[PDB]
Amino acid sequence: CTCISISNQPVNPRSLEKLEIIPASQFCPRVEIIATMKKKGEKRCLNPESKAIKNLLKAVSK
Amino acid sequence: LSRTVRCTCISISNQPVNPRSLEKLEIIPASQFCPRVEIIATMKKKGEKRCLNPESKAIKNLLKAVS
Amino acid sequence: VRCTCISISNQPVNPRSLEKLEIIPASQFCPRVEIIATMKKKGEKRCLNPESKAIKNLLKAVS
Amino acid sequence: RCTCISISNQPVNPRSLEKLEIIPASQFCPRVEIIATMKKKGEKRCLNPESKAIKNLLKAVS
């Protein structure tokens, strides 16, 4: 897929420009949570398993 | 200061979306370029881009649903 | 469709802060050319003047 | 991680283009990319930033 490497690193919501979620397609057996950081626009993936993701979305809501 | 450009969504839809029909989904929290969160649903069919109303209680379950 | 540009800046673009640059030719619900530039920092967008020449340069300087 | 996997070779009618975007070589994708969004069925297509045509096409669409 798009992630060459998933990250277990925490990401502070307030540093999120746009969070992207791409459910398992027909040519990518697995979920993909790509975060796009503000500064520099750093793009890194997120381990779908990690627990903080299980609430990072609820965060980017307000 | 005042913002130069507009937000990405002309309209936000209250209609719910079946998680399995989503091909993508992206949350874009506010900024001083679009002072409000825009939830964009990218459907599988006709690569259409429908925006979802973050207010809709519907667009609060669709996220856990995708993972 | 609509025109995303509320404004257009005559300021010069940091050819190296240019995260991404879009060129939306004139449509129907937006009868004009819009040149949007997203700067890396914060990923903030800024419209550029398509009549200006800063474009002949910048645009070319980005390929 | 890059957006463009395989840049296209065949010419894009300078008018039949709905939107064009340039992403200069970044710390997240070593190469200057050019995605041509097509009106009809809004297909997406990576152009070849080298074809002398492109250099001119980016000019024409302004």
UniProtKB/Swiss-Prot annotation, chain C:
Disulfide bonds join C3-C30, C5-C47. This is CXCL10(1-73). It comes from Homo sapiens (Human). The chain holds residues 28 to 90 of 98 of the full protein.
